[PDB]
From Swiss-Prot, chain A:
<protein>
    <recommendedName>
        <fullName>Sharpin</fullName>
    </recommendedName>
</protein>
<comment type="subunit">
    <text>Monomer and homodimer. Component of the LUBAC complex (linear ubiquitin chain assembly complex) which consists of SHARPIN, RBCK1 and RNF31. LUBAC has a MW of approximately 600 kDa suggesting a heteromultimeric assembly of its subunits. Associates with the TNF-R1 signaling complex (TNF-RSC) in a stimulation-dependent manner. Interacts with EYA1, EYA2, SHANK1 and SHANK3 (via ANK repeats).</text>
</comment>
<comment type="function">
    <text>Component of the LUBAC complex which conjugates linear polyubiquitin chains in a head-to-tail manner to substrates and plays a key role in NF-kappa-B activation and regulation of inflammation. LUBAC conjugates linear polyubiquitin to IKBKG and RIPK1 and is involved in activation of the canonical NF-kappa-B and the JNK signaling pathways. Linear ubiquitination mediated by the LUBAC complex interferes with TNF-induced cell death and thereby prevents inflammation.</text>
</comment>
Swiss-Prot record, chain B:
<comment type="function">
    <text>Component of the LUBAC complex which conjugates linear polyubiquitin chains in a head-to-tail manner to substrates and plays a key role in NF-kappa-B activation and regulation of inflammation. LUBAC conjugates linear polyubiquitin to IKBKG and RIPK1 and is involved in activation of the canonical NF-kappa-B and the JNK signaling pathways. Linear ubiquitination mediated by the LUBAC complex interferes with TNF-induced cell death and thereby prevents inflammation.</text>
</comment>
<feature type="modified residue" description="Phosphoserine">
    <location>
        <position position="3"/>
    </location>
</feature>
<comment type="subunit">
    <text>Monomer and homodimer. Component of the LUBAC complex (linear ubiquitin chain assembly complex) which consists of SHARPIN, RBCK1 and RNF31. LUBAC has a MW of approximately 600 kDa suggesting a heteromultimeric assembly of its subunits. Associates with the TNF-R1 signaling complex (TNF-RSC) in a stimulation-dependent manner. Interacts with EYA1, EYA2, SHANK1 and SHANK3 (via ANK repeats).</text>
</comment>
<protein>
    <recommendedName>
        <fullName>Sharpin</fullName>
    </recommendedName>
</protein>
Length: 43, 48
């Protein structure tokens, strides 16, 4: 029972960590569409 | 809080990405996400 927002945010984190520029860019756009409030922290 | 003199490159980019997503800036968010991806930055992206 994971939300769409949760899965999108996790996709974006994984895309960035894996070097997937295209996917990271497109997933970020989709999150921006929903204007999601996210915490983006460094590990 | 970190004053701007105590922020790294990645930290500034991570904050730019959050702000861009939260404001509805698709082109802005896409640009920062790609830059972060090119460096394969290790990020936590959390629903708040």
């Amino acid at each position: 029972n994971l939300t769409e927002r949760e899965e999108l945010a996790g996709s974006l984190a994984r895309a960035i960590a894996g070097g997937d520029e295209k996917g990271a860019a497109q997933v970020a756009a989709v999150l921006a569409q929903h204007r999601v409030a996210l915490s983006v922290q460094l590990q």
